[PDB]
DNA sequence: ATCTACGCGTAGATATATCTACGTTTAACAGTGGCCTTATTAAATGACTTCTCCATGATCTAC
């Protein structure tokens, strides 16, 4: 996640400095929950980034 | 793994939103005619207390 999805999701940060963090900084584990499979904004951007990465 | 901070789920309190709809009979009448019983009978029979129980004085008779 922080290797590839984070730089495309987190727009303005140092990617190497992003490589040494916790998943919640970009996923938002305060919410998290199986609700990521729903229609939430982070789900939207994650799906967009995944679809762009693998075309 | 543990301490600490913070964002979120949630429950309680509150203001809001709910399209059709309207017009819902106006008129004139609410029987005009004639009758509202004609006959006849207005009981026919017999019965209308039944009975005692009397009041008073002269006379007979027993003690």
């Amino acid at each position: 996640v922080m290797g590839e999805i984070a730089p495309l999701i987190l727009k303005d940060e140092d990617k190497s400095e992003l490589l040494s963090k916790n998943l919640s900084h970009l996923l938002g584990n305060s919410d998290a929950k199986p609700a990521i499979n729903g229609m939430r904004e982070m789900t939207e951007k994650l799906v967009t980034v995944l679809e762009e990465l693998t075309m």
Side-chain angles (χ1 to χ4, degrees), chain A residues 12-35:
Chain A
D12 43 80
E13 300 80 1
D14 182 306
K15 53 102 196 167
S16 34
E17 172 265 339
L18 293 177
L19 302 189
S20 56
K21 289 180 170 186
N22 179 300
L23 194 59
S24 151
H25 66 317
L26 92 165
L27 175 290
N29 277 347
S30 50
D31 284 343
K33 283 165 187 177

Side-chain angles (χ1 to χ4, degrees), chain A residues 2 7 12 14 17 20 25 33-34 36 45 49-50 52 55:
Chain A
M2 301 67 68
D12 43 80
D14 182 306
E17 172 265 339
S20 56
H25 66 317
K33 283 165 187 177
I36 300 136
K45 38 175 202 52
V49 159
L50 185 38
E52 158 268 1
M55 42 301 299

